[PDB]
Enzyme design. Sequence first.
Site, PDB file in Angstrom:
ATOM      1  N   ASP A  15      50.790  84.093  31.568  1.00 17.12           N
ATOM      2  CA  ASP A  15      49.613  84.101  32.458  1.00 17.12           C
ATOM      3  C   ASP A  15      49.890  84.568  33.869  1.00 17.12           C
ATOM      4  O   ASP A  15      49.036  84.450  34.743  1.00 17.12           O
ATOM      5  CB  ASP A  15      48.845  82.727  32.390  1.00 17.12           C
ATOM      6  CG  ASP A  15      49.699  81.565  32.825  1.00 17.12           C
ATOM      7  OD1 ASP A  15      50.717  81.862  33.568  1.00 17.12           O
ATOM      8  OD2 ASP A  15      49.319  80.395  32.607  1.00 17.12           O
ATOM      9  N   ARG A  29      48.037  85.604  38.959  1.00 15.96           N
ATOM     10  CA  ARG A  29      47.816  84.508  37.953  1.00 15.96           C
ATOM     11  C   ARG A  29      46.433  84.737  37.317  1.00 15.96           C
ATOM     12  O   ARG A  29      45.425  84.912  38.012  1.00 15.96           O
ATOM     13  CB  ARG A  29      47.899  83.186  38.736  1.00 15.96           C
ATOM     14  CG  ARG A  29      47.552  81.950  37.893  1.00 15.96           C
ATOM     15  CD  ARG A  29      48.514  81.785  36.760  1.00 15.96           C
ATOM     16  NE  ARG A  29      48.396  80.408  36.149  1.00 15.96           N
ATOM     17  CZ  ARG A  29      47.509  80.056  35.226  1.00 15.96           C
ATOM     18  NH1 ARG A  29      46.635  80.954  34.764  1.00 15.96           N
ATOM     19  NH2 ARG A  29      47.568  78.812  34.690  1.00 15.96           N
ATOM     20  N   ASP A  34      45.444  79.042  30.562  1.00 13.90           N
ATOM     21  CA  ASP A  34      46.808  78.454  30.753  1.00 13.90           C
ATOM     22  C   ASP A  34      47.586  78.760  29.518  1.00 13.90           C
ATOM     23  O   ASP A  34      47.248  78.326  28.412  1.00 13.90           O
ATOM     24  CB  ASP A  34      46.673  76.912  30.956  1.00 13.90           C
ATOM     25  CG  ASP A  34      48.000  76.258  31.387  1.00 13.90           C
ATOM     26  OD1 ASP A  34      48.749  76.922  32.102  1.00 13.90           O
ATOM     27  OD2 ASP A  34      48.147  75.058  31.098  1.00 13.90           O
ATOM     28  N   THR A  35      48.647  79.512  29.690  1.00  7.75           N
ATOM     29  CA  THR A  35      49.631  79.724  28.627  1.00  7.75           C
ATOM     30  C   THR A  35      50.717  78.704  28.725  1.00  7.75           C
ATOM     31  O   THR A  35      51.050  78.282  29.773  1.00  7.75           O
ATOM     32  CB  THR A  35      50.241  81.162  28.693  1.00  7.75           C
ATOM     33  OG1 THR A  35      50.660  81.474  30.031  1.00  7.75           O
ATOM     34  CG2 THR A  35      49.209  82.204  28.306  1.00  7.75           C
ATOM     35  N   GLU A  37      54.482  77.487  29.234  1.00 13.86           N
ATOM     36  CA  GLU A  37      55.641  78.040  29.887  1.00 13.86           C
ATOM     37  C   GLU A  37      56.617  78.608  28.866  1.00 13.86           C
ATOM     38  O   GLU A  37      56.580  78.284  27.730  1.00 13.86           O
ATOM     39  CB  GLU A  37      56.310  77.027  30.812  1.00 13.86           C
ATOM     40  CG  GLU A  37      55.390  76.341  31.788  1.00 13.86           C
ATOM     41  CD  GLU A  37      54.833  77.235  32.872  1.00 13.86           C
ATOM     42  OE1 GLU A  37      55.539  78.148  33.243  1.00 13.86           O
ATOM     43  OE2 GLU A  37      53.707  77.010  33.337  1.00 13.86           O
ATOM     44  N   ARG A  75      49.574  83.795  44.910  1.00 14.82           N
ATOM     45  CA  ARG A  75      49.292  84.640  43.729  1.00 14.82           C
ATOM     46  C   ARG A  75      47.849  85.094  43.772  1.00 14.82           C
ATOM     47  O   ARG A  75      46.945  84.322  44.086  1.00 14.82           O
ATOM     48  CB  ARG A  75      49.533  83.851  42.398  1.00 14.82           C
ATOM     49  CG  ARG A  75      50.929  83.236  42.372  1.00 14.82           C
ATOM     50  CD  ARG A  75      51.218  82.523  41.063  1.00 14.82           C
ATOM     51  NE  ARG A  75      50.399  81.316  40.984  1.00 14.82           N
ATOM     52  CZ  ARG A  75      50.419  80.469  39.946  1.00 14.82           C
ATOM     53  NH1 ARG A  75      51.317  80.565  38.958  1.00 14.82           N
ATOM     54  NH2 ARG A  75      49.460  79.507  39.878  1.00 14.82           N
TER      55      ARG A  75
END
EC number: 3.1.31.1
Length: 129
Positions: A15, A29, A34-35, A37, A75
């Site tokens: 992401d 971002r 949400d991916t 980690e 970001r």
Amino acid sequence: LHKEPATLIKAIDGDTVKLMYKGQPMTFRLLLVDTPEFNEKYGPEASAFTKKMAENAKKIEVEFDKGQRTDKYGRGLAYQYADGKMVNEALVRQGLAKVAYVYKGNNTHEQLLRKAEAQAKKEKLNIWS
Ligand SMILES: Cc1cn([C@H]2C[C@H](OP(=O)(O)O)[C@@H](COP(=O)(O)O)O2)c(=O)[nH]c1=O
Ligand SMILES: [Ca+2]
């Protein structure tokens, strides 16, 4: 909203990506997702997916929403397109990201992404397996 040009500097993970936007390097971002980690389950698969989508694209674009354009880490916050296809949506449709971080006033594409998430969950894909 509207698409603006950017070019790929380097893949980071599911992401985040480093792009050049208005001629300046910046880490983006992806909005509304949400991916995992890299160190979590499906993290490597999410990273591979967005690295491939971005690296194979002839034309990357970014689209800012109506609200904040950078987060507290500096970001950029946008929707990213690769040859016209939204990466944010593609991740969610493949079960490689959850819809997440839906803040009021940067949520233009929320319902598009929720409909993808519902289809991924129906298909039991990846995170939803
Ligand atoms: C996606 C997104 C994340 N963020 C902040 C919230 C989270 O703060 P915390 O770092 O305090 O948890 C963090 C999550 O990003 P990551 O999922 O990249 O870790 O980024 C925003 O502020 N706006 C956004 O639109
Ligand atoms: Ca993440």
